[PDB]
Amino acid sequence: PVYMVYVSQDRLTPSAKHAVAKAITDAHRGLTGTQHFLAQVNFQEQPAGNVFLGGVQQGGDTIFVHGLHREGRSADLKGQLAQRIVDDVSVAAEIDRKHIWVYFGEMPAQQMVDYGRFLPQPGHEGEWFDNLSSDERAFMETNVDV
Amino acid sequence: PVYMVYVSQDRLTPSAKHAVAKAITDAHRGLTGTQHFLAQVNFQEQPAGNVFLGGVQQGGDTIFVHGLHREGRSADLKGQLAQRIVDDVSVAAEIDRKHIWVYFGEMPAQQMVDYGRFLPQPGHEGEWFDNLSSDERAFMETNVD
Amino acid sequence: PVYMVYVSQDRLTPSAKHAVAKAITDAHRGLTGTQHFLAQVNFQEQPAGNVFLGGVQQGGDTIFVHGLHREGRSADLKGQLAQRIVDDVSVAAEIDRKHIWVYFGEMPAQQMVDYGRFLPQPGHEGEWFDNLSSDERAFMETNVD
């Protein structure tokens, strides 16, 4: 997946950013079984004051996660995954859940490219990864945290 | 809603950001009935020159509004809303309509969370809000201009 | 289309941004027939270190292209287009293909506005353009490289 995470500049330290990325990555892996290295977390920082809620300028505490997924998962699982992102990002960023918005968008795997390759259908990541070249598997496997 | 608004840095001063965000917010409430406080307008600024149209580098006037909505509204209503955003952002930003791009994407409400809560189906915002906890209600009601 | 291109700050010089924007734009016009000036390439730069893959902080080499399209093209065509974007961005940016991610989202043309006007269905780009006003066509025709 690609998780676009919109946050205010300097709201999250380098350590907090690593924690939030790990919370999202672990939630995705844990609930979908997709490999660690396929989860992209992409932080989009903007100055505090660039978020408005009901026309009211906000401080630096809003977090919007825009998750870009393949089609094919159940509403039940998607709901579990959004709730776990809310809960675990709240802990990782030390931020009240009321500040956290989470939207999942879905597209056919056939129009979705990670690491320059077209994605498989959900749940068939094993078939897919076994079909990757040695160099691609090696590059992929370095993008997993200890 | 979440409206991602992609603009060149400083094209909208702080007060113009407020005017643009209030115009989008009012248009969304006016045409859908969704409370003011559910409208998020999230300004994404980039240096001028990062926008290309037909391969040609642009100055600082293009505005792209990417609206993320719940599924469930009619094509007619979404057309009216997109036109009003074009019209009312043109006035708030004092910018030519020909600089304004607006795309709406839709998702099932069941995979959409505002303020840490899953959204209801469209015209159901009232009962949904009433059934939130008292602290949640109080927090969103601060976010009304 | 609107192509949001997420890159690290200073990874692409102005020359390389132009080459990347041209590669995507040529790819889209060449496989869809849509006119040049309708392809927006919108570079979103962030400090290197804001991209994580599997929890690991990245350098400045990742590129994510989020293309936002009208509904109605075949999966075959979309696959050809995504692949050409991988290939031609890899050359233009001098970056390995393994660093490049490309997702396409699609939306009904009726909730999609370029240059302040609603888009037509794919393939109808010529008739739509002729119905626009002289000043709208003049503005758009300057956006061809």
TrEMBL record, chain A:
What Gene3D superfamilies does the entry give? Macrophage Migration Inhibitory Factor
Alphabetized InterPro entries for the sequence:
Cis-CaaD-like, Tautomerase/MIF_sf
Instruction: List residues of the Tautomerase cis-CaaD-like domain.
Output: 1-128
Q: Which residues bind (R)-lactate?
A: 28, 70, 73, 114
What is the top-level taxon of the source organism? Bacteria
Q: What is this protein called?
A: Cis-3-chloroacrylic acid dehalogenase
State the organism's lineage. Bacteria, Bacillati, Actinomycetota, Actinomycetes, Mycobacteriales
